[PDB]
Structures are given as structure tokens and as C-alpha cells.
Amino acid sequence: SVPSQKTYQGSYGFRLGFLHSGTAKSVTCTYSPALNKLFCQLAKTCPVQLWVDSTPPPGTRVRAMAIYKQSQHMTEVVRRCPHHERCSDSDGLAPPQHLIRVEGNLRAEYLDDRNTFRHSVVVPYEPPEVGSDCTTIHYNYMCYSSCMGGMNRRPILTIITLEDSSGNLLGRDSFEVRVCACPGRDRRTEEENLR
Ligand SMILES: [Zn+2]
Numbered sequence: 001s002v003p004s005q006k007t008y009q010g011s012y013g014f015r016l017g018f019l020h021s022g023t024a025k026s027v028t029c030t031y032s033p034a035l036n037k038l039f040c041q042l043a044k045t046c047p048v049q050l051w052v053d054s055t056p057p058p059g060t061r062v063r064a065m066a067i068y069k070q071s072q073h074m075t076e077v078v079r080r081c082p083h084h085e086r087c088s089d090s091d092g093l094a095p096p097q098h099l100i101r102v103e104g105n106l107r108a109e110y111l112d113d114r115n116t117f118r119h120s121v122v123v124p125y126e127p128p129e130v131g132s133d134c135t136t137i138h139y140n141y142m143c144y145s146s147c148m149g150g151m152n153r154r155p156i157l158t159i160i161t162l163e164d165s166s167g168n169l170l171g172r173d174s175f176e177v178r179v180c181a182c183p184g185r186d187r188r189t190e191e192e193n194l195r
Contacts, residue, residue: 001075001116002067002074002075003065003067003118003159004159004172005067005157005159005172005174006172007172007173007174008169008171008172008173009171010162010169010170010171010172011054011170012052012053012054012055012056012162012170012171013051013052013053013054014050014051014052014056014162014170014171014172014173015051015052015171015173016048016049016050016051016160016173016175017048017049017050017051017134018031018033018038018047018048018049018175019031019047019049022184023183023184023185023187023188024184025182025184025185026184027183027184028040028041028044028045028183029041029044029045029046029047029183030183030184030187031175032187032190032191034191034194035176035187035190035191035194036174036175036176037175037176037177037178037187037190038158038175038176038177038178039177039178039180039183039184039186039187040141040177040178040179040180040183041179041180041181041183042141042142042143042144042179042181043089043140043141043142044140045103045138045139045140046138046139046140046141047136047137047138048136048137048138048139048160049134049135049136050062050125050134050135050136050137050160050162051133051134052162052171055127056125056162056164056170057164057165059124059164059165060124060125060162060163060164060165060170061122061123061124061125061162061163061164061165061167062122062123062124062125062137062160062161062162062163063120063121063122063160063161063163064100064102064120064121064122064137064139064158064159064160065100065118065119065120065158065159065161066078066099066100066119066156066157066158066159066177067118067156067157067159068151068154068155068156068157069154069155069156069157069176070154070155073154077116077117077118077119078099078118078119078151078156079097079098079099079119079150080096080097080098080099080142080143080147080150081143081147081148081149081150081151081152082149082150083147083148083149083150084096084142084143084147084150085097089142093106093108093110094108094110094121095110095112095119097112097119098110098119098121098142099119099141099142099143099151099156100119100120100121100139100140100141100142100158101121101139101140101142102121102123102137102138102139102140103138103139103140104138105123105137107123107124108121108122108123109121109122109123122163123137125162139158141177141179143179144179144180144181145177145178145179145180146180151179155176155177155178156176156177157174157175157176157177158174158175158177159172159173159174160172160173160174
């Protein structure tokens with residue numbers, strides 16, 4: 001099977017937000033609204049905002065999962081390549097096989113679905129703090145899109161779901177991701193090719 005990727009704001013008006021980082025050759029993470037695509041460097045911080053019209057119940061959680069964008073690859077579990085899964089770079093919480101990690105959150109949980117075998121990382125949803133209108137989760141992608149034996153140049157989508165305490169769906173959003181050496185240049189290139 002394959003996880004749904006249908007955008008769903010739900011009862012709480014859930015949707016994602018991205019910073020405006022620009023396309024300088026030195027940028028480490030940049031988002032393209034026109035392509036609904038995040039371009040980022042390997043293992044660098046990717047700030048992702050969570051926006052809601054009303055605060056969901058305590059116990060609400062936020063899960064991140066990657067799936068291949070191409071239908072012919074959709075059933076394949078997105079995982080780190082044979083090289084990176086063995087480079088001993090775990091932060092002591094993320095299993096070395098997981099592509100997506102959450103930075104600086106000791107309550108982050110990493111799941112290996114006993115049924116689908118898919119990987120995901122989930123954290124408790126925290127309402128915005130004083131002075132803020134949104135909540136930010138810092139994600140890391142641990143393989144390049146080009147890693148052989150892994151993503152292998154195949155594009156992926158990250159699906160973010162707002163879930164209740166039982167894991168039931170409250171909201172969903174998604175975006176394409178390309179992990180590369182020069183996000184600024186690749187974003188500029190792809191947006192141009194779009195024109
Ligand atoms: Zn890799």
C-alpha cells in the first residue's frame with residue numbers, strides 16, 4: 001500500500017509554512033512555492049512551520065514520512081542508502097536507517113511500521129510560544145537524492161500529518177524534497193525550467 005498524500009486542512013485548519021531563504025549559492029535549505037519543493041543540503045537544518053486556525057487537543061502529534069513521488073516506485077520504502085545507514089552518525093535516538101530526523105526534540109519518536117515497514121518520525125504538537133504565531137519543527141534529511149542503492153536520483157515527497165493520540169488523521173500536507181549539494185542553484189534551475 002501507499003500513504004495518502006492528499007492535502008487536508010481538517011477541523012483545525014492545519015497547513016505548513018516555509019521560511020524565505022533565497023537562492024544564493026551558499027544557502028543550505030530553500031523552499032520553492034511554485035514547485036512545492038524543498039531543496040536542502042545533506043543533514044542540514046530544515047525549518048518547517050506548522051500553522052493552525054485553532055489549537056488542537058493536548059496529545060496531538062505531528063508525523064513526518066517520505067514516499068517516492070513516482071507511482072512506479074511508490075510501494076518501495078524510502079530509506080537511507082547502504083553507505084549512510086552504516087556511517088555511525090546516529091544522534092542516539094534516530095535509527096541509522098531513517099532518512100528523516102527531527103533536531104533538538106527529546107520527545108521525538110521513530111517508528112518502523114510493523115505492517116508496511118515504512119519509517120516515520122513523530123513529535124508532540126506544541127502550541128506557538130509567546131510572541132509566535134506558529135510552531136517550528138527542525139528536520140534533517142540524511143541522504144542525498146542521488147545516493148546509489150538508496151533514493152537513487154528518484155524524487156521523494158515528505159508527508160506531514162497532524163494526528164490525534166491514537167494516530168488518527170486530523171490534517172495533512174506535503175511537499176517534494178531534493179537533497180543536493182547546491183540547493184540555491186538547483187532551485188533556480190528548476191523554477192526556470194518551469195517557465
Ligand atoms: Zn546516502
